Amino acid sequence: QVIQIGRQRFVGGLFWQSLSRRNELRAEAVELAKKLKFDLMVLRIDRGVAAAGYANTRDGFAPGHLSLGAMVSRAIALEGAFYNGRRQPAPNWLGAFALPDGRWAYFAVRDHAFMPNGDWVGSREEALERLHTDYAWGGWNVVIGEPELERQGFQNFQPKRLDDLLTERWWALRPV
Ligand SMILES: [K+]
Ligand SMILES: [K+]
Ligand SMILES: [K+]
Ligand SMILES: [K+]
Ligand SMILES: [K+]
Ligand SMILES: [K+]
Ligand SMILES: [K+]
């Protein structure tokens, strides 16, 4: 299900795979898509990360769909986060955001990379359940998300709406 944000079509629900950094990154990503059985990919390569985000046409994904996760994770990697009265990098963060159409997005990032299923879209209800479940593992710098999550009483929380974080060519899904 595309997520329409302004006149752009975004997607959640990619499967995130960290890459070895040892071989040609693109060729490694392709070979892993073949083993994991995915026909679409995005490639996230910056100083903080070498990772591929995968999807299948059969699940309703298509070339040209933009990765919402890629966009959000980039934006936090650049800005960092505000908590404890300080501006600091947030390599380990989790969050949930209202999308314009009423669905919610859930994100779980460690060392500036997505956890394998840390990019999810569905109901508010289930986004919160996913957030708490991952939260229990610990090692999280901050929860970043919809201002109403303050009432969850996480130790470190930064209110943030998706609008505040909003593209780059690399976000678009392409054939493997
Ligand atoms: K991985
Ligand atoms: K993975
Ligand atoms: K995504
Ligand atoms: K995995
Ligand atoms: K997995
Ligand atoms: K996960
Ligand atoms: K952990």
Author numbering: 4 to 169, 178 to 187
The authors write:
We here-report work carried out on PilO2Bp, a component of the Tfpb R64 thin pilus variant assembly machinery from B. pseudomallei. We show that N-PilO2Bp consists of two α/β sub-domains separated by a prominent central cleft, typical of actin-like ATPases. The function of PilO2 within the Tfpb assembly machinery is not documented, however, PilO2 is reported to be an assembly protein that localizes in the cytoplasm in the absence of other Pil proteins, translocating to the OM in their presence. FFPred, from the PSIPRED website, predicted the most plausible topology, with a cytoplasmic localization for the N-terminal domain (1-194), a transmembrane domain (195-214), and a periplasmic localization for the C-terminal domain (215-432).
Although the crystal structure of N-PilO2Bp displays one protein chain per asymmetric unit, inspection of crystal packing highlights three differently packed ‘dimers’. Due to even higher flexibility, in the absence of phosphate it was not possible to model the anchor loop structure into continuous electron density. The conformational flexibility of the loop thus appears to be dependent on intermolecular interactions. In fact, in the absence of the phosphate ion the two protein molecules (paired through crystal packing) move apart, in keeping with the increased unit cell size. On the other hand, the stabilization of the (otherwise flexible) ‘anchor loop’ built by residues 169-179 is obtained thanks to intermolecular interactions that occur in a region characterized by positively charged residues, suggesting its potential role in the assembly with other (macro)molecular partners.
